[PDB]
Design a protein around this ligand. Structure first.
Ligand SMILES: *[C@@H]1O[C@H](CO)[C@@H](O[C@@H]2O[C@H](CO)[C@@H](O[C@@H]3O[C@H](CO)[C@@H](O)[C@H](O)[C@@H]3O)[C@H](O)[C@H]2NC(C)=O)[C@H](O)[C@H]1NC(C)=O
Ligand SMILES: *[C@@H]1O[C@H](CO)[C@@H](O)[C@H](O)[C@H]1NC(C)=O
Lengths: 96, 97
């Protein structure tokens, strides 16, 4: 990740997220956002009118990217020794 | 021999029943020209065409209706919309949720 902006994601991950779209993110739709207010009869509000609901995942997007950031950073500092135990510092030139 | 059609066109012959005005912001049991239902009715801004008495949907669920006395469209929304979840620590543990 780039420390210039606290996005908690790398350059490639942003492109990956923006390349593929999602049906309806957020799960924060209230009255006024459904037929209690005004809509064109969106599919999401029709689903909720018949007991159909979608639950959010336990892990957020930011938390998932933290694991990837830790995994990538660990490789550049220890290689694969940290996977079998404690981390072992080593120059990257000698590691490669 | 008497023949009649039901719930396809605006009606001209109705039974001997009296109206009980209009209630707002409450989910109640309404009856509009023989259309029993349940839900909240606050206001409507939908625009439609004449010769219409009911508002249909892709799932055949009523959402709008025209008041025959005030000649204005209303809205129907079920009394329960959102989902509710309850977290409990166990029966032996406690009863607070
Ligand atoms: C029965 O249905 C008739 C139509 O067939 C409706 O006639 C309407 O009667 C209402 C009674 O409130 C009239 O509204 C009144 O109009 C003026 C506005 O300046 C004023 O006197 C009152 O403030 C009130 O708003 C309405 O004009 C009239 N429509 C017409 C004449 O075209 C009527 O709603 C139904 N009768 C009832 C509810 O007793
Ligand atoms: C609840 O508490 C009682 C108290 O003795 C215990 O015996 C029982 O096994 C507990 N019930 C369950 C379902 O764990």
């Amino acid at each position: 990740p780039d420390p210039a902006k606290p996005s908690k994601r790398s350059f490639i991950e942003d492109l990956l997220y923006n390349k593929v779209t999602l049906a309806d993110p957020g799960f924060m739709k209230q009255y006024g956002d459904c037929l209690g207010g005004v809509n064109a009869r969106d599919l999401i509000c029709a689903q909720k009118f018949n007991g159909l609901t979608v639950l959010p995942p336990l892990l957020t997007d930011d938390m998932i990217a933290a694991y990837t950031s830790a995994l990538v950073s660990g490789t550049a500092l220890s290689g694969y020794t940290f996977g079998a135990g404690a981390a072992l510092q080593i120059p990257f030139a000698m590691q490669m | 021999v008497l023949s009649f059609q039901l719930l396809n066109a605006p009606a001209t012959v109705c039974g001997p029943k009296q109206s009980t005005d209009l209630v707002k912001n409450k989910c109640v049991n309404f009856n509009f020209n023989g259309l029993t239902g349940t839900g909240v009715l606050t206001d409507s801004v939908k625009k439609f065409q004449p010769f219409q008495q009911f508002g249909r949907d892709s799932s055949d669920f009523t959402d709008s209706v025209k008041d025959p006395k005030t000649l204005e469209i209303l809205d129907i929304t079920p009394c329960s919309y959102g989902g509710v979840s309850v977290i409990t620590p166990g029966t032996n543990t406690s009863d607070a949720v």
